[model samples]
Target: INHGYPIDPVPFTSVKVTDNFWGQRLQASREVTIPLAFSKCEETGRYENFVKAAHPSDTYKVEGFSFDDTDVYKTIEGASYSLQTYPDKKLQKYIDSVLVIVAGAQEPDGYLYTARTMNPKHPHNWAGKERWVAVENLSHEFYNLGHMIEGAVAHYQATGKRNFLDIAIKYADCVCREIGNGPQQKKYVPGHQIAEMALVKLYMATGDKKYLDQAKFFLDTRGYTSRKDTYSQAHKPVVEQDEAVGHAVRAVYMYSGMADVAAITGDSSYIKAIDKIWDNIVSKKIYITGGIGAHHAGEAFGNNYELPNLSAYCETCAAIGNVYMNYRLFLLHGDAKYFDVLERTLYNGLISGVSLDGGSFFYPNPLSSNGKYSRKPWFGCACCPSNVSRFIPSLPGYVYAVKNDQVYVNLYLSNKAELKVDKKKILLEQETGYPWNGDIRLKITQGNQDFTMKLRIPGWVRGNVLPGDLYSYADNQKPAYQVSVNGQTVESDVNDGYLSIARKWKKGDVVEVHFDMIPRIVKANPKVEADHGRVAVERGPIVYCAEWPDNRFNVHSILLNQHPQFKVTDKPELLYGIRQITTDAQALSYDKAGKLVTKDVELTLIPYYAWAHRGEGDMEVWLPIDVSATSAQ
Candidate 1:
């Protein structure tokens, strides 16, 4: 039996051009980071230095916390995932170049060493075998291993490269041998969240039962139980705490690994715990951008209904962790809503962490972009930027999935892939300028099996449903477009993009469908008062945000007019690679009175991923504008 998931190219693909600002941010990550790492690597003896640290006291100074150390682990993962879209050879080569450091840094006994760990005399290593310093330390030893595992996994998946994988496996084995399985076993889990997810990937690749068992042990033994009352997750229930709690990225990372384990092992309790956490996040803890883990205190999700933007604890890593958790949940639940949340975070909170050129990043992605405030190339606590690079490169995977002999197409993008399932090969071809234009066409050709193809009808499709589905996209019968199956015109309904088609097919069958791209004015639910009158423009899955430079007027000055026009415009500069979005928009503007005047404004609303490229500038996702007249650029 073969199952798969098809991604919709999302917010940037499912929504109107004006609404995809967040998606741009998600996609722009690779563009901004890969070059930065390479530039710094060459400027400094990056790989070579890391190699020297294989010995117990040799120190290799990383660019910063994010540069030479563990932060890059997330970035490497991001790059690997994001690169699947454009397949950047230079970027891949750069990753390969860095493998030298990874391999060299690894000791012959399979220890992958980072600089801080080499010096036993240094303050970070255990002081006389007792825990050193705080609950979490920046000079991560195992944390770095997590990134190595991530990079090795991505490299292996992307290019079948075993060199990096060998380094990771060796290091992981050494860790396993030293920490948990053998004599003098340590019961403590790493305070950071890095390695949990990596263990799952390692398990998948090597079929090593111990790797997964170790990962599970880590998950089961967290929060005081593992630390032995030395630390806490508030010593209360996660749902009852009502405030963002615990170490920011660590909590989410552990949760993400748990979700994966739940799916792979059919661990029901694990699934439920993560599900509860997600419910808490969405219902009370999340920002409109799907950002969770508010308040930098522990960088963990706050109490229900507690969200603050300015001092938000929305770490880039946490946002990615939340996204990954939701994705895993989506796989478990087979629900589109999970992707919806993932899509929102990808475009907004997650994208806000990185820049357009891969140069700088914000550890905490704030919603209000004041031009004077911009991201730095690196930070002292630099977990965000490297994580951004690693995550951004693989943005396409989240868009697709398959279930029980059915292919559910989630996002819309121009791409093609061949999959072998049930002893049959199925080819999926997608063509669209989605998010820019509201149309998507998929050609599904069956190779040798008579199976069913279930296409996801995005939640925002407005009306109609896929064939043999009970639900509909909207309350009204006026659908974006009609769907057809084998020229027979089968009846359809829309529910989470799954248009079910069960038919006896050959290798050349095709499925054609279209969706309306409508510009929508979205206001926060009254409960979410932060976004009161300001409306966010959304077409397809893209959430569009206006920057100060994009408009002649001050961004904060613009307010939303209830009725505004959303028009599609082309942007050639943005079309450099296999990107998720492709447009600029001319929409409603303010009037003479200056209170949402309802006139057209020549505006350039960038995908959240593309913001920060213009330097530190004032920006707003919720706009105050007049909708009567269309703006012409």
Candidate 2:
């Protein structure tokens, strides 16, 4: 009666990212983002708050906002992931120093939260009347512990040190005993999610059933009370819900935990619920850049197809959470659609949160801007930058997955990895100029096993940009792709969204693939009223945006007259070498008669993720198409 997943992702430790596209970002994260984050923590008194909570006589005074402790913990998690590939003793020592203060602050029963521990009643006194009193909302107590658990697990995995993990386990044990369906326990869920997933991870790491049970209990007991609200996905039983509502980050993170529980426990209800929710999101809720959460107020999602451009509340953490959920779905179902969303979100909305220099961040990543929205060095909430720090360093792991004797190339990234199958080891080395170009060359550097290698035929060039009728390319024509093995052009058919190649691989076995990388216009479904006469530009998997600096004219006034001829130019000097698209466009003008007139102009477009790096005035991914001229004539 065991229903386990067929596919398993290869850990980041086994993969090394060497491509310029991602390698530069990873380097920046380790050298710039991580160090700068520690400095910010010190400047904001996040670290000092921990020290104060740990030792009362120290008297530095508690500082920072309510969720500041989570930021520090997330930084620790980011540092831990960095240690996996970067491997620096100084970095490890710094992490150890941070954890020393964190460990000291934990109560003997394993309760930790600087705001609660330091002050019984101070600074708003939100959690009045005692600890865990107003557990339904108001306090972010469990929210803080969620980050701590995730950080502890990351630290344990990276350094084999039990110091942080032990702290987390003590806290988790306390959580399990306090909140459950027992005579003396309380039946309350977190105002914010993520603790469920953290408990699942703890269970997976320790082989403890109680942690798993607690994760299920939290998810199961949610939405059964008066506290149920869309902001926390607590309006109904998770299985009965269909739409992607609530705070985008919380919804996706909770769905991810549900997926994990379903995968491990083979619960049909959880699987069905997530499947329905995924469809709701992919079809109606998500934006062109794979961003979600349209409403800026509460940073939550709106109704079906209620997408907007300028007011998009596409929180960076939500994008990261979506990627995590889709990846889990891919592992559960082995479907390419999940990876399709993963790749789109990774290249666009997710990366757009972080600036090119890796120092600044965008808490809300809007597709269209009006010369005002820009990256900030840090924010009062300050969750997005820390999330970016942890996510970017772990990008290499998503490229490959293994199922029994078969290897699935989920994403085309340049890297080297050693994967094991049936006690047999294989070295997979991939070289590609992907996102910019679709030419991928993969080689089996060392192997003697006969196995199937499934290479993903990306949604862009393979079939519709996405499955179903959610969105479609302006041109419905499928681009031709070629695949060759050992310098021989081989005829292949895409089965289950992959070019399946099963054969015995030698040490020098080579496979080369070329996908059409021409720039094209993308149009959303007519149901999306906002994009009625507009088209977005895309080249390969990377979405392009037009900025006011590149156009020198108001980018908002330009229109694509007739599918402007596109020229791809490589700008190595800008944003660490990106491919820019130059095209002929028209500027909308009118006389006193209110007739639309066109002025021919040339425009330059860069990758959406690379926008706001330069001094930004205005930027947009989707541009208006002047159909009025045809009607006027």
Candidate 3:
């Protein structure tokens, strides 16, 4: 069954990523990131708190935030994905050990939440004396359980074990029995969203309609509370709430949940609400890096076009949430625009959350940094690192999707996927050096199923950075994308941003694609006062920026020429063999004698995600451009 989504994403287990870029990151997460999560959770007493709840101590205090349980759950979810594709026995065993500790924290009646269980008499200040009290406030019991259910589903999918799933099911049953529209029920929305979708995950995994119904109950009852604030997106009901608001992570999580609910329940209200919100974000709130959350105050979205570079609060969790929401949107309605946003955020905003090693992480991926910004091995909140641990290993699933008889290659990655089209098995092999080289080769490794294969024509190669007017290339140049089948040129129309090839594909049939990789200068819409007269460089999906370490000069004072030519070269020694961009610009700085002078200089900008790796310094994604610095050629 498709389970309401007409399109289904190919499971990560079926897709094998072999590319040098993302494949290595997936390997790092399995090797480094997964162990680091458990280690940090151990050190931070995240694991201890679960034990403490199982056995009370006189002088014990719950460590970290009340919501720290979700960090553990998220990490477990990440490890599960790794186990599914990589099949690590030790990891599954370690996860079982952790699940035992988590299971001990649950109450006899299947209720969980250690922060409350450790000492229910003197619970965390945010949690009221009674269970599920003040959920609309700072109570995060549902948030924790939501992640637990998600982890449980992933654990089951990976290992076919029900130990963690049973525990999650028990807690979810407790939640279902406690809160609902029945006579013995009480209604409340989550302080932080995810439970809505997590419950759906459980519903999909267990064929339980109560879980799905309860999930809808949470969305339907939102904003009907006495707390009439945008901080929780409780300003209005889900259908009427149009703008992206409040805490960025929670807002996007809620949107993703809405998409899930819409997919399963056939709720048009949920679709309309998120449609307007997505448009609002792509048009007004998002950064050139595809990062959202413009303000640092609440880590929230600011007004339209009020994107600030220095004070950007593009939380790593938010970008992850953005990708989740966009992917669901694409599934609900087969549109390449959603994947465009997804791919942009995937390369720029989302990956920037974690470092190359996947150990250190950036909680907030600001557009520009002033030498002070850097990644941390761990944060006090500790949500983003754990989130990335699960997110990175699961990247392969986003590459391919199926709708009826059509298969869409959504992303350009070197991978092979075993897909089923029209009830026939098809093993497809895809090879590409994307984001670096534009050439791609695809071949049907097995099965001769007659199906229409659709490959995404990336918005970047088509000169469309994002779906709306938030950002634009310096010049509009829509180069034709050349597609060939077994050395024969195939001229075809792009149907909905996808070049379709309807053929009875046989074994060993080859399909090749090519697009010119022209580095282009980008300018923000004039409505964005923060980026007025400023430009940024982009090639493919990667957003390039000037960091102080790369340029050895003040990046803030660099004036880019209005018509600058960019040179792309392979710098194998830097940042895992990244392609470096060299462009001419005027550097405004004082000479050794303290005299203000302008001198011609070549600016070396690296991918925006690769910043802070070579030690912290000034970095700017948006560079100032002036007519005076016209092309010297």
Candidate 4:
């Protein structure tokens, strides 16, 4: 039982989600998103790029971006996860059909990357002039293969099929031969990350030390690359980097790989570096919805506390990566704080990337949006939609974890889960409305044990908006919660954001958890220029935002009174039955004579993720506090 990370999440295969909220989302993904994604990839010619590679017509024109191939691979990766849960033979056959095209794209020397292969002499602009010139010139070659390997590995895990995994191995081996420190090997790192993490996945899939070693080598040689800018996290060696800078998606993917390598190698420097970086993000960079990457200029992080509402570039891909990174951190150190951040992102930023219909997507999730901002069916760089496709089906894996004799219930999804620690098995059945209701009913139907069960008490209920000084509940009051066993009150003090119960369990045991579900006004640090004197409303893990359709008025003109009255209502007919928050406020309006006027009104807000779905209009998560300002009025 000597371990890789001291703690491990129960595999999604062992958990079956049956909740209302996430269950609908998952069902839509399996039925709508996966199929739509594949059709989009095909419609956008992302799949055709492979056909052009295998059979080179003299036309010699590559489709879309050099990284477009990843759209197909990412969707396949998600479809594989869907297969694991849904078990559709039709889906399996569909994935296999795409595998043929992917396999056809591979070069005889085990090389792959359609942009370069389609026309080596006249490569895509991002592909550079020479073959390996992409290493220095932002080729995305390694990045594409990284996704291919991930999808192939996932397909392998789902169906145990070697047709796809063998193709991935061919490409991985080619990459290993091309980029390394060997005298004959050319030194190159991924211009975009993901190869580092995917290589580790490949290593675990094939039981090969070279793949793992190659993964570490890529992480080790990052800063020494030609691109030494923070935009790529190549400014310095990963271990020497402390702050969270650079492109948010690339930064987190590299950090995730570092965590994976650290777990296997027992390296302390990696942990120290990412540990500080994580703090920098939560305390300074993260949005109220747990979204990161504030700047739209380079799609990178801005200075600390530079969160802007209207121009936020909280890329859905970044949120997915953030969740992956935080979960890795939790596995390394068994704590509830990481899951708290992850949960917020999952409910808000991550799911916000995808729309209610599951076809449209938002690449940059802004806190405040003008009528112009809306979800599109696809983009030329359609990474976010494909990312959501893969991420949605993988949600069940984040629910539970095990460390020796203890079981950590990380998330509050209504699911039946079975976890095995050493020789003991723990069967759990959970029922909760979650974001709508605060009470969770957990029953141990079987697998009796004396192991400790640690339940995560969300930061929102604990008077801590997050793990850092970035945001806090405006009232500074801790919500009350109760824990009981078989209707008997248990005084379990929260430790590290978890309430631990160390009592032995029987077949008919039950644990009841209740947290006062109150919507509190949350404010950011004063240094955050965009959110100064403004506040956001939150209940449990969900952040509420004001949308024009919900208010049917100028949502931006609503001003809260000093002691605003909030009414929480359950609208079973709106946004898939969410708990909408209505607050009493004053609306700033103009009279017929062009005179400024104010009148009593009500402000309607839905979950932050539910915005842009009811037709585009003004939407804001942080509302104005002072009427003295000219713009807000």
Best candidate per TM-score, number?
A: 4
lDDT of 2 at 75: 86
Rank by lDDT, descending? 3, 4, 2, 1
How do the residues 548-597 of candidate 1 rate in per-residue lDDT, one tens digit apiece?
66676655655443455445555656623212222233343445666544
lDDT digits (tens) for residues 290-409 of candidate 2: 888999887999888777888888999999999999999999888788998888899999999998788999999998887877898788788998898788888888989999877899
Worst 10 residues of 1 by lDDT: 466-475
lDDT of 4: 0.87
Model 3 agreement with the true structure over 240-299: per-residue lDDT tens digits: 988899899999999988988888887788999999999999999999888989988888
Please report, in order, the local distance difference test score of every candidate based on alpha carbons. 0.59, 0.84, 0.87, 0.87
List TM-score per model, in order: 0.78, 0.95, 0.97, 0.98
Best by lDDT: 3
Candidate 2 vs 4: which has more lDDT: 4
Model 2: clashing residue pairs? 371-617
Clashes of 2: 1
TM-score of 2: 0.95
Give the clashing residue pairs of candidate 4, or none: none
